[PDB]
Symmetry: C3
Subunit: 225 residues, 3 copies
């Protein structure tokens, strides 16, 4: 029991948050036109990176009536994400991008990102429960957007880049992390209702291992291995 | 006077809310691609039904700075709307859809829906007045979105379905219920300013009768009768 | 020092606000289809004028979790903007439009509008500082949207008019007032951090003179002079 309690209480800042930022900004760099956008519109590229890094907090704040940029009061967290964005886009002489994009190192940051994703899902359900004790649909919605993040607002992340693809969206066709966050927010909600006979730390540990194995396998298979 | 006081104080839950949900989900089913969407993207179809059922509360909460999903704390109300959505889309062996879509029965639910629409317009003006005693434009805006509902956000209801028709919107070209809600929110605001020499229950009664006669006639004429 | 204190404390209502409304509605009238929109959809034209007049307050309220229409409790301010919208669009027999659009008179209102823009940038940083003492990114974001105004939501101002041009936006390609508001909100934030060794009234005075000279020159040069 001590292993599940220690695994579910590790400080995510700054190492696990940096891994979350690295993977998110790497995905941004591989989007069509992102490199050219960072040179012609550097501010819009930075703002796009902030959406990838903190979109889950923006979305949760929007759903609960809090300031959508409330999370940007975390100065050192925003500065850390900005440094990741700068090193990946404007530092060819720096070994940072080549190291973090190296697949063995990249798979470690993918696993650490899943640790942050599961913690954010649980915190969303817990925070929504604090405001609505028996509001099950509010808990599920809050935990879902904390896990999915920028994927649910992808239509407007594209709009910021000058792209408009209204034929599809993350709700009409869910990817794996969005669908997995939906199953995850239901399990964490049922754990709050005491109908799920599982401890909270055991669910955080087991669901994180499920997300780590799936994401590491998908990232390695997507790289043809 | 007792008839207007009893008509304007009938509990809308659950019968009048169910009639509101039935008519709203029926309109959703007749939209292009809705049946295919409910089979390929059942969650997006459900979320689209929630926008049709509770869009007026989402919009009013957005205008006043409240949580946009605050109304989803009403568990039994959300569950009731979900049951209407399920019976209309995934129950061909159940006599529910054929009965509620039968035109004589459908016209009764259309009339009951207008009872709910007028009550929501008045409650929007009253609630906005409680926060802004002499904020006339806030009262009118709040009562308008409580009456119009999902129509004012139709461009983004279409976006959820993969449709984008930016050439028109409900503000640029108002339909009858949106235009009637605009006239209704002005009358209820003037009744709050005491410049309109009419009782509050008399205005609820008379304006509901106006909406019932118009909506029943339009629904029957639209069916070629 | 008394000149900078008197220049930065002049009541903007109603004269300086009227100049802000006149220039904003004039820009609206010169947009493609605006005159035809005011005749076929007068309410949508009015709502579009309100976005041009009060979009900076709507955007700031959205960023900080306040009611997006909170500024519409200022009745006399909304009525004043409505009168400017009515005189410019529906009064050909009235000398108002021809006088305010006359270039020498128009350049005076352009200068007075810049006085209001700088005051709104400073008030945005000050108000965000009141809620977040050391939230630098929240102060900069709040002051930026107070200065840029409707430009940052131009994609949805176009959507209200039935126009959709997703290839560009005000963030991907900043115009001068949006870019100048970004530099302005940084200077006013640094003045709040006490790292900028300049008085608050001296920064308001000098930055307003910079915006007046730039905007008057651009408006006169754009008219080929
Ligand atoms: Cl900090
Ligand atoms: Cl590469
Ligand atoms: Cl309940
Ligand atoms: Cl049928
Ligand atoms: Cl007033
Ligand atoms: Cl002219």
């Amino acid at each position: 029991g001590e292993l599940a309690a220690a695994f579910a209480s590790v400080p995510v800042f700054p190492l696990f948050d940096a891994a979350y930022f690295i993977v998110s900004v790497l995905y941004l760099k591989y989007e069509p036109g992102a490199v050219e956008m960072s040179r012609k519109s550097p501010f819009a590229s930075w703002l796009c990176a902030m959406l990838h890094c903190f979109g889950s907090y923006i979305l949760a704040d929007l759903l609960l009536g809090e300031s959508p940029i409330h999370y940007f009061s975390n100065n050192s967290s925003v500065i850390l994400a900005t440094a990741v964005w700068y090193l990946i886009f404007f530092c060819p002489m720096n070994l940072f991008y080549k190291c973090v994009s190296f697949l063995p190192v990249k798979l470690i940051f993918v696993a650490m990102k899943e640790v942050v994703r599961v913690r954010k899902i649980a915190a969303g359900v817990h925070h929504a429960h604090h405001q609505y004790h028996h509001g099950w649909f509010i808990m599920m919605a809050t935990g879902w957007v904390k896990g999915s993040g920028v994927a649910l607002m992808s239509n407007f992340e594209q709009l910021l880049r000058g792209v408009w693809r209204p034929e599809t969206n993350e709700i009409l066709h869910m990817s794996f992390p969005t669908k997995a966050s939906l199953y995850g927010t239901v399990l964490f909600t049922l754990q709050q209702t005491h109908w799920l006979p599982v401890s909270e730390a055991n669910l955080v540990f087991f669901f994180t291992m499920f997300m780590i194995v799936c994401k590491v396998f998908m990232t390695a298979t997507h790289s043809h291995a």
